[PDB]
Predict the structure of Bromodomain-containing protein 4.
Amino acid sequence: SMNPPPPETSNPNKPKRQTNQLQYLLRVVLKTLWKHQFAWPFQQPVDAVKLNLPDYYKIIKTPMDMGTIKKRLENNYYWNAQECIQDFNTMFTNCYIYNKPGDDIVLMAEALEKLFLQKINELPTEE
Ligand SMILES: O=C1CCCN1c1cccc(NS(=O)(=O)c2c(F)cccc2F)c1
């Protein structure tokens, strides 16, 4: 029932790049999902205490959220686009694992994920 430390957003010895695909992931993908009416539950790590989800981090062992993704993008934490795309997919998948079909939060994730997929479809070719 306690919260873990959030996912890493800073790690100086981790190799980093800024690529045109990673720029797109910030300026288009993250920006698009962040402004959405259903973004707010996903804008920070799940607070299992405040939300009264004592089992959450006993079930979800790779937590992820857009707050974390936003910091990772702003701090140029990634090596490539795939790492960032994986974080979004982890966020959506966690929601679907933990909750049940038709739950409000699942409907919210589904709407964000639809947009996510539309934007990743238009991912620019590298460099
Ligand atoms: O699974 C996830 C990922 C992001 C938040 N989340 C989740 C799952 C279950 C309950 C809550 N608690 S909440 O934020 O107050 C909330 C509700 F209680 C009902 C509908 C939407 C909500 F956001 C949050």
